[PDB]
Design a protein around this ligand. Structure first.
Ligand SMILES: [Ir+4]
Ligand SMILES: [Ir+4]
Ligand SMILES: [Ir+4]
Ligand SMILES: [Ir+4]
Ligand SMILES: [Ir+4]
Ligand SMILES: [Ir+4]
Ligand SMILES: [Ir+4]
Ligand SMILES: [Ir+4]
Ligand SMILES: [Ir+4]
Ligand SMILES: [Ir+4]
Ligand SMILES: [Ir+4]
Ligand SMILES: [Ir+4]
Lengths: 122, 122, 122, 122
């Protein structure tokens, strides 16, 4: 699924995920969020199963963005965990954890959870 | 926190996280899980806030492991999202999402969630 | 939103959530899952914000099902946390945690996470 | 585990969970949070597995608090999902989802996730 995953993806929020899948299991690219304390592109890196089951199962993958670039620093990081599903309407279905840096007193309230679905068309 | 993060960390399960933090926000290393469908080391990559707040807040970070190496393929990936807290007893406090590849029918049951705390001593 | 919430709801899996919202903030009803180790109806109870903001915000709510009834016992419980959104296409948008009973050794793998969206039509 | 669960529990934040477990699987009680937009006691309800496995597994359970009482309304609800572990140092180990009411535009940022461990001594 190197070919299937590599490319430009869009989620339901209007965010843009640009990724290259390497033969070895690497994910590298950029992410641009349509929402939040974010502007322009941010580095992302991650990993995917480069030899997935051939029983029609999805391909497990995940990636991280730290929300610091040359424009802004939101002192936070999001990780997406999910699976790539190939076919006519390819999809990456994810759930995510967004942690922001906090004091120890506020650590209980440091992590948001959500879900994003990416497609190859906006 | 490049110096603070780089090194060998251990969680409550007895897993070993070996990481290098780059000046640019990169995380690269290996992970060895004490539990699950896992043996020996797996590649990890991730990101951290390389210019965190100086108000005593933690440093946000995250990373991904795809559970394929030369020994096993568990057709799954975990992402950890959390913060590094420096000091005498440094800690990385995380929550994680483990997704495994599934059929579309079983996708509702594809993702485990948990929490790991890493310290510099086992 | 007592009137808005009370009734029969369906999610994307084909599950059926039958709920009564009380004036005091109570949720009581039954849940029937289309998937998993489940058959027929299970008791549910929960709570909702009975005086929500009137700035167009959703109404926060949550509920629990333990997966034991007269037919089956899956030694597990799910909680849904989410918000009710009123209007022509009313929705309850949720994320959920499903914990199953485990040994202490397997507790790291005890909890699934997902997301369900309920509507008033299947 | 009716007897084991019923009583007063405390988490790592200093919150107080007061619960009665019914023979039928009901949980009913009050919760007082040491943190957040909260004061005094809030109603809780939930469910537990009233016939758990006898292979040394934990007992699955969950409960909900809507954060409205006579003092405050935080327009939010938390659900805890977890398992009760009996013995000399009884514990309830949970993960939780806290959703607050939002506009549709801000729904992506509506849900916090965390983990609480309750014991019978503070
Ligand atoms: Ir395989
Ligand atoms: Ir999903
Ligand atoms: Ir959704
Ligand atoms: Ir700052
Ligand atoms: Ir935590
Ligand atoms: Ir813990
Ligand atoms: Ir209000
Ligand atoms: Ir959602
Ligand atoms: Ir969805
Ligand atoms: Ir059993
Ligand atoms: Ir846990
Ligand atoms: Ir913890």
């Amino acid at each position: 699924d190197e070919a299937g995953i590599t490319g430009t993806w869009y989620n339901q929020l209007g965010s843009t995920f640009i990724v290259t899948a390497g033969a070895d299991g690497a994910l590298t690219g950029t992410y641009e969020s349509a929402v939040g304390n974010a502007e322009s592109r941010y580095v992302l890196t991650g990993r995917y199963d480069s030899a997935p089951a051939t029983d029609g199962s999805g391909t497990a993958l995940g990636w991280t963005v730290a929300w610091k670039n040359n424009y802004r620093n939101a002192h936070s990081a999001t990780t997406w965990s999910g699976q790539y599903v190939g076919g006519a309407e390819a999809r990456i279905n994810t759930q995510w954890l967004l942690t922001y840096g906090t004091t120890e007193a506020n650590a209980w309230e440091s992590t948001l959870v959500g879900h994003d679905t990416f497609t190859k068309v906006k």
